[PDB]
Amino acid sequence: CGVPAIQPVL
Amino acid sequence: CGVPAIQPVL
Amino acid sequence: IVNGEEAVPGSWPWQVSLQDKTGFHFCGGSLINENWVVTAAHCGVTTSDVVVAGEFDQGSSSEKIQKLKIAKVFKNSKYNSLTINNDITLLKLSTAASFSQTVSAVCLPSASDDFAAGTTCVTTGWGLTRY
Amino acid sequence: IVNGEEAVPGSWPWQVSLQDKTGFHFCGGSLINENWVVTAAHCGVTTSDVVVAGEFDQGSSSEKIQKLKIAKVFKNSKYNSLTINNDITLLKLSTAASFSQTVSAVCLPSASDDFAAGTTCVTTGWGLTRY
Amino acid sequence: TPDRLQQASLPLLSNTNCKKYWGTKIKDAMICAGASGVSSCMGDSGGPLVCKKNGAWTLVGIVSWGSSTCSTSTPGVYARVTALVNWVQQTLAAN
Amino acid sequence: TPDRLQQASLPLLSNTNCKKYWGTKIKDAMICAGASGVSSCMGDSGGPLVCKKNGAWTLVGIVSWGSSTCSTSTPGVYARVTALVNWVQQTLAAN
């Protein structure tokens, strides 16, 4: 859980 | 419908 | 209801109470017949909820209440949760209500029926009396 | 979200959209696994509602979205509709979500886990951007 | 919340006049009543707004939203049943 | 509502400090965040409030209620997940 394949860009 | 057996007392 | 008065017991036979399984009163409803209850879509009624008919004093154990099961929830699909517009939900009961002296139906108006501003109507319920 | 920014597509894989049968987006949710979705109890989700996963642009027809059916609605029975306290509802999907690169689960914290005031977190969704 | 059922009389208002309090929150499927010294409050939602017509009570409004305080000087907002009854009649006939 | 997904960062606040805006509306199972130039708004309800901890994102809040205007200077109110997770873990294990 919590580790998306496409890293969020903040 | 709409004619209750126990008349509401307002 | 803020500033209301206690009703005559059984005088609003169509008035029902929506309770969750904890027995907590969270919304009101109206019986339109023995198998259908009208409430607010925003009440968020689920089939684990129960409809209580013929009740007056919610802290009374000697009242002959009818606890009815909910078979299905029909939220009007025009209901807008952003604006709370079209805030109507129907509930299909699993178990027909037993119409008595204290359990009856309200009439539905005509799409055409006219309720003039200034007319005095009545609202009922078990909502807060003070805030 | 007022003052937000457009997300990177697929960067919030747990984010879902609750739509009614009209196809209208009325609430957001989060996937906790392939069979369970967490939302707000006040959203009033019914089994006629649908959960859309892996979506970014709601006005796009070429996205490979997953529309999932709702089997059952579990509203926490401590939910208080008067105060909106305990505003959590779980949804059991009829059809398992297919975890992909754009469809995943968020982690749940520990009842004991500590989130200090001042910490910077992130919220997402398809809520209004202006009022 | 009170344990015995409560009642109150309250006048109906026009949407126009209602917009003076609420504005654009008022929709065509909404009907205001109140601002008369009483008000529906939390827990009253989903309940009845009835009007006696031709001798019987008829549902004209469903308790919706209003003042966050239940102020008795602001009008309550109820679902306008007249605009939703074609849906109820269709829902009952199907199921 | 926007058609593409939006995001925003926002700080968490203590319930105490939160009560300065909201008061008693704030309950033990509520958590505030925001008042930082952004705000959740209508349609965001039920969605995520996540915080990166030990490298992964974890759900700390569920979009609940707030400002009727979505004012970016008032804190949003989210369901505090830490106080509700024992219920989710019980619900999943039963069903």
**Cα C57 to Cα B4: distance, rounded to the nearest angstrom:** 18
Interface test with C, best of D22, D81, D88, D131 (most C CBs within 10 A): D81
Contact F72, D130 (CB under 8 A): no
φ and ψ at C9, to 5 degrees?
Answer: -60, 125
**Cα C22 to Cα E52: distance, rounded to the nearest angstrom:** 35
Cβ atoms within 10 Å of C32's Cβ, excluding its own: 19
Contact F49, F78 (CB under 8 A): yes
What is the token pair recorded at D33?
């696994």
Residue closest to F30 by CA, chosen among F39, F22, F38: F22
Cβ atoms within 10 Å of C42's Cβ, excluding its own: 24
Chain F residues with CB-CB distance to A1 below 8 A: 56, 58
Contact C40, C74 (CB under 8 A): no
By CA distance, what is A8's nearest residue in D?
D11
Q: Is C32 left (phi over 0), alpha (psi -120 to 50) or beta?
A: alpha
Cβ atoms within 10 Å of D94's Cβ, excluding its own: 13
- Span E1-95 CATH architecture: Beta Barrel (2.40)
**Cα E15 to Cα E19: distance, rounded to the nearest angstrom:** 6
| D7 has a chain A CB within 8 A of its CB | yes
**Residue ranges per domain, chain F?**
1-95
* Pairing label, strands F30-34, C5-6: unpaired
Contact C78, D23 (CB under 8 A): no
* Pairing label, strands D120-125, F6-11: antiparallel
Residue with tokens 């997904």, as numbered in its chain: F5
**Residue ranges per domain, chain C?**
1-131
Contact E7 B10 (CB under 8 A): yes
Long-range contacts of D25-28 (CB under 8 A, 24+ apart): D25/D58, D25/D126, D25/F1, D25/F43, D26/C80, D26/C81, D26/C82, D26/F43, D27/C81, D27/F43, D27/F45, D27/F46, D27/F47, D28/D124, D28/D125, D28/D126, D28/D127, D28/F43, D28/F44, D28/F45, D28/F46, D28/F47, D28/F48, D28/F63
By what technique were these coordinates determined?
Answer: X-ray
* Pairing label, strands C50-53, C36-39: unpaired
What is the token pair recorded at D112?
């004991």
Cβ atoms within 10 Å of C117's Cβ, excluding its own: 15
Interface test with F, best of D88, D120, D129, D130 (most F CBs within 10 A): D88
| D121 has a chain A CB within 8 A of its CB | no
User: 3-state SS of chain B?
Assistant: CCCCCCCCCC
Count CA within 13 A, CB hemisphere, residue D109: 23
Contact D4 F7 (CB under 8 A): yes
D13-48 residues labelled b (16+ CB within 10 A) or e (exposed): bbbbbbbbeeebbbbbbbbbbbbbbbbbbbbbbbbe
By CA distance, what is F25's nearest residue in C?
C131
Q: Check if C25 is active-site.
A: no
Q: Which CATH number fits domain D1-131: 2.40.10.10, 3.30.559.10, 1.10.760.10, 1.20.970.10?
A: 2.40.10.10
Count CA within 13 A, CB hemisphere, residue E69: 6
The catalytic residue positions of D are 42, 87
DSSP state for residue E84 in the 8-state scheme: T
